[PDB]
Amino acid sequence: MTMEQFLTSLDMIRSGCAPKFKLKTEDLDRLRVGDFNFPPSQDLMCYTKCVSLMAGTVNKKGEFNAPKALAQLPHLVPPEMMEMSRKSVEACRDTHKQFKESCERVYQTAKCFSENAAGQFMWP
Numbered sequence: 001m002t003m004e005q006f007l008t009s010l011d012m013i014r015s016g017c018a019p020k021f022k023l024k025t026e027d028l029d030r031l032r033v034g035d036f037n038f039p040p041s042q043d044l045m046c047y048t049k050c051v052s053l054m055a056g057t058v059n060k061k062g063e064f065n066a067p068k069a070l071a072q073l074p075h076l077v078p079p080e081m082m083e084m085s086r087k088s089v090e091a092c093r094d095t096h097k098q099f100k101e102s103c104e105r106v107y108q109t110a111k112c113f114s115e116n117a118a119g120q121f122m123w124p
Contacts, residue, residue, distance in 0.1 A: 006078045013124035017050035034121035036111040045107035051124050052106045058096075062105030066093035081120055088116040 021043040052058040057069040092112035
């Protein structure tokens with residue numbers, strides 16, 4: 001996919017998940033730019049689980065599937081973002097083992113991704 005297609009995909013992905021939750025637009029826009037540096041509500045955390053479930057990178061228990069995520073990347077991000085995404089998959093594939101609750105497992109993995117990107121990170 002192209003960067004232009006990617007950028008638009010962010011909104012389409014959000015559209016499938018955001019209506020299920022009570023969300024503040026200021027919070028989503030911070031996540032959108034990779035700013036995970038504020039306290040998340042439970043809704044925001046579960047929002048990230050819904051996004052990741054849409055991506056097929058986690059299961060219903062919030063467990064991150066690193067080999068499948070790696071397999072799915074060419075359908076998820078554009079070529080410009082492949083290497084950093086691959087780097088983050090590897091760097092964050094275990095951080096989900098340190099939390100027990102499914103929404104927090106995914107949120108914390110997502111936060112880890114944002115901290116292991118060399119500036120190029122965007123969340124739907």
